[PDB]
Amino acid sequence: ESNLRKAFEEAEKNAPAIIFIDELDAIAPKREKTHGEVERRIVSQLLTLMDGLKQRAHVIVMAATNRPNSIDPALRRFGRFDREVDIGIPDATGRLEILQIHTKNMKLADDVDLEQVANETHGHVGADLAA
Amino acid sequence: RPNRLIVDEAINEDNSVVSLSQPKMDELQLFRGDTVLLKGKKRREAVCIVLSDDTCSDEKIRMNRVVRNNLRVRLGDVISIQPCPDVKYGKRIHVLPIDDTVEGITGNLFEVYLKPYFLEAYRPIRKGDIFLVRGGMRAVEFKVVETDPSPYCIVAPDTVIHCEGEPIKREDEEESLNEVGYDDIGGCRKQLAQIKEMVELPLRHPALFKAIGVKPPRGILLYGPPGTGKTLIARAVANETGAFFFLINGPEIMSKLAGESESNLRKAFEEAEKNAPAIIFIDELDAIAPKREKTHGEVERRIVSQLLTLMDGLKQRAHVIVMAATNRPNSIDPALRRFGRFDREVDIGIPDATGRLEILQIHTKNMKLADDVDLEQVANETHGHVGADLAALCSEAALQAIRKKMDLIDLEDETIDAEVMNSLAVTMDDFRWALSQSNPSALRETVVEVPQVTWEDIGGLEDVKRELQELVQYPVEHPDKFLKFGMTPSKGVLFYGPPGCGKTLLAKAIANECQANFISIKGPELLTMWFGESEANVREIFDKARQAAPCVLFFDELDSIAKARGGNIGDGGGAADRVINQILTEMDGMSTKKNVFIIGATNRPDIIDPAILRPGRLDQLIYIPLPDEKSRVAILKANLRKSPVAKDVDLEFLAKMTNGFSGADLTEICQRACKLAIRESIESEIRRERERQTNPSAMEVEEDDPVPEIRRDHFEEAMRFARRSVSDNDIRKYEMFAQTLQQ
Amino acid sequence: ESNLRKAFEEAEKNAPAIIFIDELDAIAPKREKTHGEVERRIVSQLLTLMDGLKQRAHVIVMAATNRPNSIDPALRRFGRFDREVDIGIPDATGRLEILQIHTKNMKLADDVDLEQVANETHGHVGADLAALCSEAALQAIRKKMDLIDLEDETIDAEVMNSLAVTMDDFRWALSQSNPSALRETVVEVPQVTWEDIGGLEDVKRELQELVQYPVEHPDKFLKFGMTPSKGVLFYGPPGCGKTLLAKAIANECQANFISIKGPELLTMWFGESEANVREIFDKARQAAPCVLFFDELDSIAKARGGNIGDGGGAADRVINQILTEMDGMSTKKNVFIIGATNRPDIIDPAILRPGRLDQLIYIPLPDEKSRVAILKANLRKSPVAKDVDLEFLAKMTNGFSGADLTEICQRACKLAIRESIESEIRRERERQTNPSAMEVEEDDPVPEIRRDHFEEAMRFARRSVSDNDIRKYEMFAQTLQQ
Ligand SMILES: Nc1ncnc2c1ncn2[C@@H]1O[C@H](COP(=O)(O)OP(=O)(O)O)[C@@H](O)[C@H]1O
Ligand SMILES: Nc1ncnc2c1ncn2[C@@H]1O[C@H](COP(=O)(O)OP(=O)(O)O)[C@@H](O)[C@H]1O
Ligand SMILES: Nc1ncnc2c1ncn2[C@@H]1O[C@H](COP(=O)(O)OP(=O)(O)O)[C@@H](O)[C@H]1O
């Protein structure tokens, strides 16, 4: 817990900041999935820190999760995570755009048709087109 | 003495009015326009003007917040109305603001706050007072720090206002006018008249309860959905009666350390014990005191049993009221609802359509709306919003109106000029934009309200109308005759008749007539907990009806569960009894003191189990017939509440062509006929708009051609194809059952 | 644990004491409900202290628990909590006694009838009638607030002795009160008398022949190895008064009456274990003598009868439970069993066995003479229908069930209510023309019930029980008879 309490501390004395809590469902799972006691201390240490924002320097806090079902439902009230944005997998014309970003540095020969590679690779996400 | 009265809050602001009864000024040698001197505690004086009031009593004086604060009094105290109409004109005034209200404003405050405030008002002012000015976007309060001649002076058209200087630091003896009060709650008129009647006496005058020797309240439990304004009722009550509101929170008690959480509760009650009549608010009770079987550890059993022993330790001493707020009153440990503990329970439901309008007029009081926004329209189309959501909608409509004006304020300075702020205005376009990206939070929740359906909304069937009027109004409006005789008024009524004849409309209309709440439980909802989920659900729905007396409970499609039993297997026949068995188990337990009316609708009267029909329960059988011809001139008329005036439509001619129909299908024929008319107007204007491609704004200017008119020649074309829902086998199946019940 | 050890220390060195352990089920719950270890330490710390009470000082220890099921069964052996006393909720005449205790200090005015407030507040416990008396004084001082407005810290005595409490305040305090008992098994002596029912004097005698003397004259039963019948089954057409007979006899012998309805039987018929049958009989044991009543006991059998009846395996569960702990009755305790059913063909022959309920008393349709008496009993409210000539009532409407006769008059009075409503509706709208032109004081025609409405009300009658139903009972009656 003392790592969370000193994580929001620096963001309060360091100008308009943005805090990013990655893999939220690893530290704030569903209440019925919490069996022990130290994993009910982390969640309630996170909840009391969100409500303590006294119109601060506009410390925006964003979190990333895989499935909005698994997040503890207490993190949906007002004053907490309320605005939700959906980042879906790229479509057939999206995947052509990821290719032209990563291959920008490389020196392609004049025989590669990236459109052909774009429309064939259904099932890939942004990270697989970087490998 | 004919001077000391009681005070009460105001409605029409106006920081310089007090309301007095006509005889009071008549016997107190007072006249119109006479300035009066008011004197109260701490030897403070405030100068005001008096005026008549239509409904003011002799011993009560109505005045707003600002005048009360200056006198340093509270609700229900005594004041001196000593009159003196002699004030010499002031020569030069020095008015300066308070520090923590003009943060990053600057500009000339005189010509945008004070100039429209003193203009043609002749306000009488006194040294040392405070007044509040509703600015263009904020609420800035000032403090008269010097006057000439001192201290009584009335602002005149020829004075010298010196609004220059650094703001005064906030003192220690004030109420901080920019804080919550009884006028900052809307849609909670009834509930705030119960928390106020059971709390003012122990907190305002404590000494009385010691002499009388009776038991004060020691716990109030407010429940409702989150965001409906529960912690604002506790903060409003503490700020006006005079108390020591000390909030303890749910989450930060549960997450302090190991066994040190209990030492936070033990020393939280200590301040409330040695700091005058206090009020403690335990927010989110269900986070620290859940059911016994959800407590899987041991340190969650230590906190609960530490909360119980502190509540039982409150025996007299100082008066300490402890309120708690919980979402669902089923999740709280059932050992807390005993006596000497949380016993009085208040319900704060979601606001209704006339409530959502009042939340709007509270949050938008500061802003300056343009003259095209009709708050009635925004109020009635936002069903599913709680009080906290409408406070975000009124904020998004402001950010958008400044988003489209950022050029005037391009980077400005650290402080934004007050002239541009007063130039802003929000329109209906912004509000429609703020509603789009808004997610209401109530949605799926049982709504309790008085439906607006009137008697005229249903055509015919007046014989049933008188019958149902007998069983509802007279047993509750004229009880003395029923007090005589061992009469048992019917506790239920059953409807059976052909489908789509308007059974639900009859139940709705009665609730509107008697002005009682309406609760509807549908068929598919009734089979929701029929399988798997326990029968615990069927309990609170009766407690929900019980607390909201008077009410008219409604069961829709009662025979749905029996139909599932009928089949190739029907393995749920005993399961189908589970929901049924709970229904009779929780229907014979109602008392006559509370009134609850149960109405059940069905369409297969031969398939209902005989157990349901029995004396003492819902037993009056009423057969709703199919509308008989002439009735359709009232059913089809009930769909002409739109504007389908089809020239010489001759509804009498339209009445005779319709023969042997039902009530639901007739509504469809009006909708189906209109749909063709709507489409036909489209091909018109499509023809009209493509004709404009030749003549540029010369021949064709939309000269009332397409226009909503609705035509007779379009009405009958849809009628050629219509599905007669009058099944000969089905209607015969009901009538011989009607005769069987008749004979 | 060191708090319990130092709690019994004073009682052992401070004279004859008495210890009271409130809310015992919070520290000694059932074994399976104990999951941790620190809550298995407290229980075994309480058990080793009770066994150490060997003479020395005379320390009695009582404990209060809500439900004896939830107490850990280890606290039932000898040398531990063994004597058990049951404090039930007050009855209709009990609640009048709680009122006169708490209102002793107050100064009631000469208009409050405490008996009226006592009999209409069913569902309240002792503690709840103490709040009702408190808010009837707070309301009656809130209305005199002007005389004692603020005043000072000390209140004069005369302004207190000028107070009074009326019925209005008591009626006001009743509205905002939530009784806490409600859904609880009500057991007490019913007030129904023999005369409340008409006819069936042959069965009226027979019930007295089966229950009354086997407990008042047991010396003659000591001679002969008689095993007096422990159960009686009533069967007949539905709505004929079986429940009335069982209520009346309990009043005649002055024994507690415990009723079990059909839906209650189906509550634990599914899913829930058969521990619900445990204390249902155990309530009867402690409250001896008592007349247990089983109503619609063939409902479980009827549920089995159907398209599938997959509850047949569940059906034998309850019948086994009833049969298991009903042949175990002892002749020392006086617990009497009575059953009622309207479909005697479906009940399994198993319960129809010697040693169990075996007397099958057939309740017939009401007799012609009885139909006259049934009318008079239910119409003892105030039906003065001038020259009614009620002897007409029975003869024209022959062959009617008992429950139907009660219904037909309830509707008849229902229309009579309407006529009186329009009677004063006409008067009040006629009063709009004459302003207070009443030399004599009269407001209503003072219920002047006529006779003409009764025959008009008879028009909507119903032949519910038909020839088909009555034939089945008689042929089964002849089956038993021959
Ligand atoms: N009249 C009202 N009724 C309900 N809510 C209101 C009203 N006026 C304002 N509100 C908003 O409701 C919110 C209640 O505060 P909050 O603690 O967030 O919710 P809750 O009180 O339900 O826990 C406040 O932020 C306030 O802005
Ligand atoms: N005065 C009326 N008489 C007959 N039917 C009507 C009347 N007003 C509306 N209706 C039709 O009755 C329908 C309502 O049906 P409802 O009674 O709720 O269904 P159910 O009979 O299955 O409960 C509406 O769709 C409407 O078209
Ligand atoms: N002497 C009587 N004989 C038959 N029925 C009576 C008599 N007195 C009253 N009744 C009516 O008959 C009904 C029978 O109900 P009850 O005896 O409680 O159960 P059941 O319907 O199983 O007999 C009662 O509601 C009562 O109103």
PDB file of N, CA, C and O in Angstrom, chain B residues 201 209 211 298 301 339 344 478 481-482 484-487 539 565 569 571 578 581 586 588 593 740 742-743, chain C residues 39 120 135 138 141-142 155 178 180 183 261 266 270 307-308 310 381-382 410 413 417 421 447 449 460 462:
ATOM      1  N   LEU B 201     -35.540  18.455  17.507  1.00  0.00           N
ATOM      2  CA  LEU B 201     -35.734  18.573  18.952  1.00  0.00           C
ATOM      3  C   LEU B 201     -34.534  18.098  19.761  1.00  0.00           C
ATOM      4  O   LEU B 201     -34.106  18.830  20.670  1.00  0.00           O
ATOM      5  N   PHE B 209     -35.134  17.113  26.756  1.00  0.00           N
ATOM      6  CA  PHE B 209     -35.250  15.660  26.812  1.00  0.00           C
ATOM      7  C   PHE B 209     -34.729  15.096  28.127  1.00  0.00           C
ATOM      8  O   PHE B 209     -35.070  13.964  28.489  1.00  0.00           O
ATOM      9  N   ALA B 211     -35.322  16.628  31.156  1.00  0.00           N
ATOM     10  CA  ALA B 211     -36.384  16.840  32.134  1.00  0.00           C
ATOM     11  C   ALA B 211     -37.578  15.932  31.863  1.00  0.00           C
ATOM     12  O   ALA B 211     -38.136  15.333  32.788  1.00  0.00           O
ATOM     13  N   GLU B 298     -11.358 -12.989   9.557  1.00  0.00           N
ATOM     14  CA  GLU B 298     -11.556 -12.779  10.984  1.00  0.00           C
ATOM     15  C   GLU B 298     -11.483 -11.301  11.337  1.00  0.00           C
ATOM     16  O   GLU B 298     -12.193 -10.838  12.234  1.00  0.00           O
ATOM     17  N   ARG B 301     -14.625  -9.710  11.041  1.00  0.00           N
ATOM     18  CA  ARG B 301     -15.566  -9.978  12.121  1.00  0.00           C
ATOM     19  C   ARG B 301     -15.206  -9.195  13.371  1.00  0.00           C
ATOM     20  O   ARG B 301     -16.015  -9.098  14.296  1.00  0.00           O
ATOM     21  N   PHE B 339     -33.116  -3.000  18.551  1.00  0.00           N
ATOM     22  CA  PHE B 339     -33.506  -1.791  19.256  1.00  0.00           C
ATOM     23  C   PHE B 339     -32.314  -1.242  20.026  1.00  0.00           C
ATOM     24  O   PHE B 339     -31.449  -1.986  20.491  1.00  0.00           O
ATOM     25  N   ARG B 344     -34.932   3.484  12.913  1.00  0.00           N
ATOM     26  CA  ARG B 344     -35.696   4.339  12.017  1.00  0.00           C
ATOM     27  C   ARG B 344     -35.037   4.317  10.647  1.00  0.00           C
ATOM     28  O   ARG B 344     -33.836   4.570  10.531  1.00  0.00           O
ATOM     29  N   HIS B 478     -64.208   6.699   3.140  1.00  0.00           N
ATOM     30  CA  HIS B 478     -65.374   6.648   4.020  1.00  0.00           C
ATOM     31  C   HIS B 478     -65.275   5.379   4.856  1.00  0.00           C
ATOM     32  O   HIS B 478     -65.928   4.371   4.567  1.00  0.00           O
ATOM     33  N   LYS B 481     -68.483   3.881   8.033  1.00  0.00           N
ATOM     34  CA  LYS B 481     -69.476   2.848   7.762  1.00  0.00           C
ATOM     35  C   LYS B 481     -68.842   1.463   7.755  1.00  0.00           C
ATOM     36  O   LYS B 481     -69.428   0.512   8.283  1.00  0.00           O
ATOM     37  N   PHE B 482     -67.650   1.331   7.171  1.00  0.00           N
ATOM     38  CA  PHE B 482     -66.940   0.058   7.212  1.00  0.00           C
ATOM     39  C   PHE B 482     -66.439  -0.273   8.612  1.00  0.00           C
ATOM     40  O   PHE B 482     -66.258  -1.453   8.932  1.00  0.00           O
ATOM     41  N   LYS B 484     -68.252   0.186  11.294  1.00  0.00           N
ATOM     42  CA  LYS B 484     -69.419  -0.602  11.653  1.00  0.00           C
ATOM     43  C   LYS B 484     -69.457  -1.851  10.782  1.00  0.00           C
ATOM     44  O   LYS B 484     -68.994  -1.835   9.638  1.00  0.00           O
ATOM     45  N   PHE B 485     -69.969  -2.948  11.350  1.00  0.00           N
ATOM     46  CA  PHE B 485     -70.033  -4.250  10.686  1.00  0.00           C
ATOM     47  C   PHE B 485     -68.648  -4.871  10.546  1.00  0.00           C
ATOM     48  O   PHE B 485     -67.651  -4.160  10.381  1.00  0.00           O
ATOM     49  N   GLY B 486     -68.577  -6.198  10.611  1.00  0.00           N
ATOM     50  CA  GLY B 486     -67.328  -6.891  10.368  1.00  0.00           C
ATOM     51  C   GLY B 486     -67.013  -6.999   8.891  1.00  0.00           C
ATOM     52  O   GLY B 486     -66.624  -8.064   8.402  1.00  0.00           O
ATOM     53  N   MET B 487     -67.184  -5.893   8.169  1.00  0.00           N
ATOM     54  CA  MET B 487     -66.923  -5.874   6.736  1.00  0.00           C
ATOM     55  C   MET B 487     -65.437  -6.054   6.464  1.00  0.00           C
ATOM     56  O   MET B 487     -64.593  -5.438   7.123  1.00  0.00           O
ATOM     57  N   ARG B 539     -39.628 -11.295  -1.615  1.00  0.00           N
ATOM     58  CA  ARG B 539     -39.926 -10.678  -0.328  1.00  0.00           C
ATOM     59  C   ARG B 539     -39.917  -9.159  -0.427  1.00  0.00           C
ATOM     60  O   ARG B 539     -40.945  -8.510  -0.203  1.00  0.00           O
ATOM     61  N   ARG B 565     -45.127 -24.897 -16.826  1.00  0.00           N
ATOM     62  CA  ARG B 565     -45.384 -26.226 -16.283  1.00  0.00           C
ATOM     63  C   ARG B 565     -46.083 -27.112 -17.305  1.00  0.00           C
ATOM     64  O   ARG B 565     -45.738 -28.290 -17.458  1.00  0.00           O
ATOM     65  N   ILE B 569     -42.650 -32.162 -20.512  1.00  0.00           N
ATOM     66  CA  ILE B 569     -42.156 -32.631 -19.221  1.00  0.00           C
ATOM     67  C   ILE B 569     -42.714 -31.751 -18.112  1.00  0.00           C
ATOM     68  O   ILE B 569     -43.439 -32.230 -17.233  1.00  0.00           O
ATOM     69  N   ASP B 571     -40.872 -30.208 -15.769  1.00  0.00           N
ATOM     70  CA  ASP B 571     -40.177 -30.628 -14.557  1.00  0.00           C
ATOM     71  C   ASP B 571     -40.210 -29.562 -13.471  1.00  0.00           C
ATOM     72  O   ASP B 571     -39.956 -29.873 -12.303  1.00  0.00           O
ATOM     73  N   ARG B 578     -42.989 -23.063  -6.181  1.00  0.00           N
ATOM     74  CA  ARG B 578     -42.112 -22.293  -5.303  1.00  0.00           C
ATOM     75  C   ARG B 578     -42.456 -20.809  -5.343  1.00  0.00           C
ATOM     76  O   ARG B 578     -42.667 -20.181  -4.299  1.00  0.00           O
ATOM     77  N   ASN B 581     -46.025 -20.508  -3.980  1.00  0.00           N
ATOM     78  CA  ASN B 581     -46.134 -20.709  -2.537  1.00  0.00           C
ATOM     79  C   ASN B 581     -45.649 -19.488  -1.770  1.00  0.00           C
ATOM     80  O   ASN B 581     -46.215 -19.134  -0.729  1.00  0.00           O
ATOM     81  N   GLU B 586     -46.695 -14.572   1.405  1.00  0.00           N
ATOM     82  CA  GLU B 586     -46.464 -13.150   1.606  1.00  0.00           C
ATOM     83  C   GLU B 586     -47.622 -12.314   1.061  1.00  0.00           C
ATOM     84  O   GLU B 586     -47.432 -11.183   0.609  1.00  0.00           O
ATOM     85  N   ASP B 588     -51.111 -13.171   2.722  1.00  0.00           N
ATOM     86  CA  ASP B 588     -52.040 -13.221   3.840  1.00  0.00           C
ATOM     87  C   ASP B 588     -51.518 -12.496   5.073  1.00  0.00           C
ATOM     88  O   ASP B 588     -52.243 -12.405   6.071  1.00  0.00           O
ATOM     89  N   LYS B 593     -54.491  -1.972   8.624  1.00  0.00           N
ATOM     90  CA  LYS B 593     -54.069  -0.596   8.872  1.00  0.00           C
ATOM     91  C   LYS B 593     -53.362  -0.014   7.655  1.00  0.00           C
ATOM     92  O   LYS B 593     -53.717   1.068   7.174  1.00  0.00           O
ATOM     93  N   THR B 740     -70.114 -20.210 -17.195  1.00  0.00           N
ATOM     94  CA  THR B 740     -69.847 -21.187 -16.144  1.00  0.00           C
ATOM     95  C   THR B 740     -69.600 -20.497 -14.809  1.00  0.00           C
ATOM     96  O   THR B 740     -70.126 -20.917 -13.771  1.00  0.00           O
ATOM     97  N   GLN B 742     -70.640 -17.425 -14.237  1.00  0.00           N
ATOM     98  CA  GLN B 742     -71.927 -16.788 -13.974  1.00  0.00           C
ATOM     99  C   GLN B 742     -72.919 -17.780 -13.382  1.00  0.00           C
ATOM    100  O   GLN B 742     -73.645 -17.456 -12.435  1.00  0.00           O
ATOM    101  N   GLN B 743     -72.958 -18.996 -13.919  1.00  0.00           N
ATOM    102  CA  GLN B 743     -73.887 -20.014 -13.446  1.00  0.00           C
ATOM    103  C   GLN B 743     -73.144 -21.252 -12.956  1.00  0.00           C
ATOM    104  O   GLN B 743     -73.561 -21.896 -11.994  1.00  0.00           O
TER     105      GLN B 743
ATOM    106  N   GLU C  39     -12.027 -18.335  16.811  1.00  0.00           N
ATOM    107  CA  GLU C  39     -13.412 -18.524  17.220  1.00  0.00           C
ATOM    108  C   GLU C  39     -13.706 -19.982  17.549  1.00  0.00           C
ATOM    109  O   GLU C  39     -14.848 -20.324  17.869  1.00  0.00           O
ATOM    110  N   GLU C 120     -55.639  -4.361  18.912  1.00  0.00           N
ATOM    111  CA  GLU C 120     -55.507  -4.109  17.483  1.00  0.00           C
ATOM    112  C   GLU C 120     -54.052  -4.006  17.030  1.00  0.00           C
ATOM    113  O   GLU C 120     -53.792  -3.805  15.842  1.00  0.00           O
ATOM    114  N   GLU C 135     -43.573   7.991  22.113  1.00  0.00           N
ATOM    115  CA  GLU C 135     -43.955   8.953  21.088  1.00  0.00           C
ATOM    116  C   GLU C 135     -45.381   9.456  21.246  1.00  0.00           C
ATOM    117  O   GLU C 135     -45.797  10.325  20.476  1.00  0.00           O
ATOM    118  N   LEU C 138     -44.273  12.551  23.431  1.00  0.00           N
ATOM    119  CA  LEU C 138     -43.509  13.516  22.649  1.00  0.00           C
ATOM    120  C   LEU C 138     -44.412  14.298  21.711  1.00  0.00           C
ATOM    121  O   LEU C 138     -44.208  15.496  21.492  1.00  0.00           O
ATOM    122  N   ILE C 141     -46.438  16.836  23.781  1.00  0.00           N
ATOM    123  CA  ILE C 141     -45.715  18.003  24.274  1.00  0.00           C
ATOM    124  C   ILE C 141     -45.306  18.886  23.101  1.00  0.00           C
ATOM    125  O   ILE C 141     -45.175  20.105  23.259  1.00  0.00           O
ATOM    126  N   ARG C 142     -45.145  18.301  21.915  1.00  0.00           N
ATOM    127  CA  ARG C 142     -44.864  19.082  20.717  1.00  0.00           C
ATOM    128  C   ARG C 142     -46.010  20.030  20.385  1.00  0.00           C
ATOM    129  O   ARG C 142     -45.787  21.080  19.773  1.00  0.00           O
ATOM    130  N   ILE C 155     -37.427  23.127  33.877  1.00  0.00           N
ATOM    131  CA  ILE C 155     -38.831  23.215  33.497  1.00  0.00           C
ATOM    132  C   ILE C 155     -39.682  23.220  34.757  1.00  0.00           C
ATOM    133  O   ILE C 155     -39.482  22.391  35.653  1.00  0.00           O
ATOM    134  N   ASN C 178     -43.330   0.235  12.994  1.00  0.00           N
ATOM    135  CA  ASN C 178     -43.140  -1.011  12.254  1.00  0.00           C
ATOM    136  C   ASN C 178     -43.026  -2.161  13.242  1.00  0.00           C
ATOM    137  O   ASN C 178     -41.974  -2.329  13.886  1.00  0.00           O
ATOM    138  N   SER C 180     -42.240  -5.718  14.786  1.00  0.00           N
ATOM    139  CA  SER C 180     -41.071  -6.527  14.482  1.00  0.00           C
ATOM    140  C   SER C 180     -41.324  -8.028  14.500  1.00  0.00           C
ATOM    141  O   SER C 180     -40.458  -8.781  14.046  1.00  0.00           O
ATOM    142  N   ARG C 183     -44.063 -12.180  10.839  1.00  0.00           N
ATOM    143  CA  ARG C 183     -43.952 -13.548  10.355  1.00  0.00           C
ATOM    144  C   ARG C 183     -43.356 -14.464  11.415  1.00  0.00           C
ATOM    145  O   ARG C 183     -42.216 -14.920  11.287  1.00  0.00           O
ATOM    146  N   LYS C 261     -50.150 -24.522   7.599  1.00  0.00           N
ATOM    147  CA  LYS C 261     -50.857 -24.406   6.334  1.00  0.00           C
ATOM    148  C   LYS C 261     -50.125 -25.166   5.233  1.00  0.00           C
ATOM    149  O   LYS C 261     -48.964 -25.556   5.374  1.00  0.00           O
ATOM    150  N   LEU C 266     -45.137 -26.786   1.889  1.00  0.00           N
ATOM    151  CA  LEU C 266     -44.368 -26.795   0.652  1.00  0.00           C
ATOM    152  C   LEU C 266     -43.135 -25.903   0.716  1.00  0.00           C
ATOM    153  O   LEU C 266     -42.354 -25.892  -0.240  1.00  0.00           O
ATOM    154  N   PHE C 270     -39.001 -28.535  -0.851  1.00  0.00           N
ATOM    155  CA  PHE C 270     -37.969 -28.492  -1.876  1.00  0.00           C
ATOM    156  C   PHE C 270     -36.680 -27.935  -1.289  1.00  0.00           C
ATOM    157  O   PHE C 270     -36.708 -26.987  -0.497  1.00  0.00           O
ATOM    158  N   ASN C 307     -48.030 -34.350 -14.707  1.00  0.00           N
ATOM    159  CA  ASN C 307     -47.419 -34.818 -15.947  1.00  0.00           C
ATOM    160  C   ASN C 307     -46.163 -35.640 -15.679  1.00  0.00           C
ATOM    161  O   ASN C 307     -45.951 -36.682 -16.310  1.00  0.00           O
ATOM    162  N   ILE C 308     -45.319 -35.190 -14.753  1.00  0.00           N
ATOM    163  CA  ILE C 308     -44.094 -35.908 -14.419  1.00  0.00           C
ATOM    164  C   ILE C 308     -44.101 -36.264 -12.940  1.00  0.00           C
ATOM    165  O   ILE C 308     -43.960 -37.436 -12.571  1.00  0.00           O
ATOM    166  N   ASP C 310     -41.812 -35.218 -10.647  1.00  0.00           N
ATOM    167  CA  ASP C 310     -40.441 -35.531 -10.260  1.00  0.00           C
ATOM    168  C   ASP C 310     -40.183 -35.301  -8.777  1.00  0.00           C
ATOM    169  O   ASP C 310     -39.148 -35.748  -8.270  1.00  0.00           O
ATOM    170  N   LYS C 381     -73.881  -9.378  13.302  1.00  0.00           N
ATOM    171  CA  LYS C 381     -73.192  -8.094  13.346  1.00  0.00           C
ATOM    172  C   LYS C 381     -74.137  -6.950  13.713  1.00  0.00           C
ATOM    173  O   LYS C 381     -74.039  -6.406  14.818  1.00  0.00           O
ATOM    174  N   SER C 382     -75.054  -6.578  12.812  1.00  0.00           N
ATOM    175  CA  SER C 382     -76.266  -5.823  13.111  1.00  0.00           C
ATOM    176  C   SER C 382     -77.199  -5.828  11.901  1.00  0.00           C
ATOM    177  O   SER C 382     -77.509  -4.755  11.368  1.00  0.00           O
ATOM    178  N   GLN C 410     -72.150 -11.503   2.835  1.00  0.00           N
ATOM    179  CA  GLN C 410     -71.120 -10.475   2.751  1.00  0.00           C
ATOM    180  C   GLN C 410     -71.356  -9.579   1.542  1.00  0.00           C
ATOM    181  O   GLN C 410     -71.233  -8.352   1.627  1.00  0.00           O
ATOM    182  N   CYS C 413     -74.584  -7.378   2.210  1.00  0.00           N
ATOM    183  CA  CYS C 413     -74.241  -6.177   2.957  1.00  0.00           C
ATOM    184  C   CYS C 413     -73.358  -5.239   2.149  1.00  0.00           C
ATOM    185  O   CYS C 413     -73.361  -4.030   2.406  1.00  0.00           O
ATOM    186  N   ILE C 417     -73.948  -1.244   1.746  1.00  0.00           N
ATOM    187  CA  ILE C 417     -72.993  -0.166   1.986  1.00  0.00           C
ATOM    188  C   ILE C 417     -73.152   0.919   0.928  1.00  0.00           C
ATOM    189  O   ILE C 417     -73.147   2.117   1.232  1.00  0.00           O
ATOM    190  N   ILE C 421     -74.160   5.000   1.097  1.00  0.00           N
ATOM    191  CA  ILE C 421     -73.244   6.012   0.578  1.00  0.00           C
ATOM    192  C   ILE C 421     -74.005   7.043  -0.247  1.00  0.00           C
ATOM    193  O   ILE C 421     -73.888   8.253  -0.024  1.00  0.00           O
ATOM    194  N   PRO C 447     -78.205   3.609   9.863  1.00  0.00           N
ATOM    195  CA  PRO C 447     -78.441   2.246   9.354  1.00  0.00           C
ATOM    196  C   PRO C 447     -79.823   1.638   9.553  1.00  0.00           C
ATOM    197  O   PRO C 447     -80.123   1.051  10.599  1.00  0.00           O
ATOM    198  N   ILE C 449     -81.399  -0.828   7.762  1.00  0.00           N
ATOM    199  CA  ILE C 449     -81.341  -1.934   6.812  1.00  0.00           C
ATOM    200  C   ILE C 449     -82.729  -2.473   6.493  1.00  0.00           C
ATOM    201  O   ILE C 449     -83.512  -2.813   7.388  1.00  0.00           O
ATOM    202  N   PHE C 460     -77.233 -13.152  -7.507  1.00  0.00           N
ATOM    203  CA  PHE C 460     -75.897 -13.616  -7.877  1.00  0.00           C
ATOM    204  C   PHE C 460     -75.406 -14.607  -6.825  1.00  0.00           C
ATOM    205  O   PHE C 460     -74.580 -14.299  -5.964  1.00  0.00           O
ATOM    206  N   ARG C 462     -74.112 -18.932  -6.355  1.00  0.00           N
ATOM    207  CA  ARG C 462     -73.277 -19.862  -7.104  1.00  0.00           C
ATOM    208  C   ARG C 462     -73.364 -21.249  -6.490  1.00  0.00           C
ATOM    209  O   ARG C 462     -73.173 -21.410  -5.281  1.00  0.00           O
TER     210      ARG C 462
END
